[PDB]
Symmetry: C3
Subunit: 262 residues, 3 copies
């Protein structure tokens, strides 16, 4: 159904079943599918396409030429009624693409809130994206990719399917990411390599000097110890008992699959 | 002319002379030129632009924001009535671009069948593309480029004008291709380099173990012999007399211009 | 106001206050804001978006899916009425983006004349672009970037905010530019490096053999002398007294901030 308070540009095409929230705004030449759900105060500038089984939050801003809920580029996919969930307060820039999941992958492509998806940024089937993230121009995510909170991805950067990107992480741009990227680190180059701890961000974010240091130590333990993960894991765990920020490493390790970057 | 069985969204703009096949489908806000020819069962999702002297097959699927038959970015080009031919069963993704040829280059940009042109993939004036190919996200082809059957091109990969890309070849992605790429090989890096034989594909494709080996030998002959091409050519030719898959090398060599990758 | 001689496609949406020049051409499904000013003989193919406080010259050609005057991706920006000025005779290709400036940056994004902005090329808030330039496919400019006359930028090339790009310069493509790029040079690679003097262009442009040589010497002085800039500056200045083409180095140095490439 559609809100009396909602604005629908005469030129737009809303399909029957499409549910549109109050005070939302649908600009010219947009197309909204019958299974779409657009939250309050959300805006579709114009020439936007929203289809599939898509759920979109409130106060989102979506620019022209974006294509959301679209069918994916998987060859196995065949019209199965997969989904897309998008949080609130996102800013989705021109030409951005967000594809519906695969039953195989789990049928769901998810995007959190308060994120910034720059131009031509691409989100593949079955990804998962947190909050307060930033994906720069042309950044491209492969299928099954997971990006965590506060993560920032350099433009023209490619993330390889199944990879995980830690919270507070910083990815160069003009980079290629093939293994998992642990929290708080900065990565770089074609085949990213760790450059250390994203201090600046931790700073800007409110982290204590102690955590920031605790964090720094963990990194060392990891990349500098010369020990194998299997040997450090515990060391970190311990540390996490005093410094909570560290537990992040742990949880992450528990998800890592492509192993980490080096 | 237009098929009574063909669907034309009221919002679309079909120009007089535009010939549209049976059961084709033209979505909202599309524009089809007067010299366009769209085959049976072909679909234009919406917000699509087809112009120029363009011939499009059947059962093709073309997504929003694609621009086909468009005029090219050559500075010498001046409105000459050049062409574009597209086969059948292709899947042309959002924001893809396919430009009309140059009289100089030969006036024709051609695309085969059953290909997969991912997002923002770009096909320049005068290219030639086979069948069952895949061009990934942001892949960009320069003018006069030739891509052969079963070829696969990594996303964010650039191919340099006049280059040739062998059948069954695999190109990395985040790569730059400046010389010709012989059949069955895998290439990689900014200034691609051979990595060997795309075994996996040959496997998946039905190639015999013998051909696959014959192929493997030819590669060696090429890159490992330490002989100059002029010296190996014959060796290969011979081999091709027993293993037909090999003749591919030959034909290729007969087209190579930028010389090969190393 | 709008010219009786101007063509406005019924489907387009021109806002009240939008001033459109004589003999201009506004294609289907375009949107022109109330503060837009489009010069004589300028063309908007279709599905184009022009908004903000934008001033556009004459005889410009703008292709579908371009987005001009759009609001920028700066997080500090908040709806301040910043501007965009575009010269004449430009050719702005599909999916190009040109964003409005920031009050902070100076509130103005400017583009000269006779330039060629290829597909998906991106111009950030507060940039400055000269004349007769070329930005290739996917080329992306960061904020506060300055590109000078005759400059040419390789596709898939990224320029870092605050950088300056000399006149007659040539940038590789699949490159990353982080420091200023002096006039007449060729740059390349991920983290561009000087390759020498763009002789070919100087040739094609009409430069004398003497200037071309004078130029060549200056380069040497710079990169080969092994002296520090502070020590060469004067040497060059002097030289500029006889060879005017050289003064370019000087002026440039006077703007350089990120220092130069090496």
């Amino acid at each position: 159904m559609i809100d009396k308070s909602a604005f629908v540009h005469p030129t737009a095409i809303v399909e029957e079943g499409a549910s549109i929230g109050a005070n939302a705004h649908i600009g010219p030449f947009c197309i909204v599918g019958p299974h779409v759900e657009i939250g309050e105060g959300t805006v579709l500038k114009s020439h936007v396409v929203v289809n599939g089984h898509t759920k979109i939050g409130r106060d989102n801003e979506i620019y022209q030429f974006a294509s959301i809920g679209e069918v994916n580029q998987d060859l196995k996919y065949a019209g199965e009624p997969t989904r897309v969930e998008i949080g609130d307060r996102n800013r989705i820039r021109e030409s951005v693409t967000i594809h519906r999941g695969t039953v195989q992958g789990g049928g769901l492509t998810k995007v959190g809130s308060d994120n910034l998806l720059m131009i031509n940024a691409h989100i593949a089937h079955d990804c998962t994206v947190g909050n307060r993230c930033i994906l720069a121009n042309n950044a491209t995510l492969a299928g099954h990719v997971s990006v965590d909170d506060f993560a920032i991805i350099g433009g023209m950067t490619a993330v390889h399917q199944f990879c995980i990107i830690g919270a507070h992480v910083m990815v160069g741009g003009c980079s290629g990411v093939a293994q998992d990227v642990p929290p708080y680190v900065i990565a770089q180059g074609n085949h990213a390599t760790p450059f250390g701890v994203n201090i600046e961000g931790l700073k800007r974010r409110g982290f204590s000097r102690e955590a920031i240091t605790a964090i720094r130590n963990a990194y060392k333990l990891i990349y500098r110890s010369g020990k194998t993960l299997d040997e450090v894991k515990p060391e970190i765990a311990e540390l996490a008992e005093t410094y909570p920020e560290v537990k992040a490493f742990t949880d992450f390790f528990a998800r890592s699959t492509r192993g980490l970057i080096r």
